Amino acid sequence: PRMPQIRRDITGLANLGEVYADASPDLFDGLDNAVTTARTLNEQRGNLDQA
Amino acid sequence: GTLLDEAATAFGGLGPSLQRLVDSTQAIAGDFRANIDPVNDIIENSGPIIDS
Incomplete structure (x- = not known):
């Protein structure tokens, strides 16, 4: 039936x-390329939080 | 004679293999009936997502 x-x-x-x-x-x-920029963002998490 | 030769050729040493075939068939069919609601849900509801 289905x-x-x-x-x-x-x-x-x-x-x-x-x-x-x-x-x-x-x-x-x-x-x-998002992996590259994600690695960059990961390496500077404290900078992003302070910002 | 011809029929017995053909039966020997077809069923030479298939004892274990046919036994495994029948056991697998019965197990698969029983488990499939036991899990028929998930199959029904998959069949009747996977269409909208893929179409979307």
């Missing part, structure tokens, strides 16, 4: 996978 829902789930899963595969490289480059 097979149309299964078809909907599989179709949505394929579409979402394609969307994420398209959007992943920008997100991962941003995550690399």
Whole structure:
């Protein structure tokens, strides 16, 4: 009785996978540089609190 | 003779393997029935999130 829902789930899963595969490289480059600036923010937490 | 040869070829030494097959099938089916409400919830509610 819940097979149309299964078809909907599989179709949505394929579409979402394609969307994420398209959007992943920008997100991962941003995550690399965000890791760099996050390391910088971590090394100076006291400076940020005083600020 | 032909049928017995075919049965020997198909069931040569599959004793343990067929036993494992049947035991696995029964265990999986029983556990699946025992956990059918989570499967129903996954199937009927994963659509909205993925579609969004």
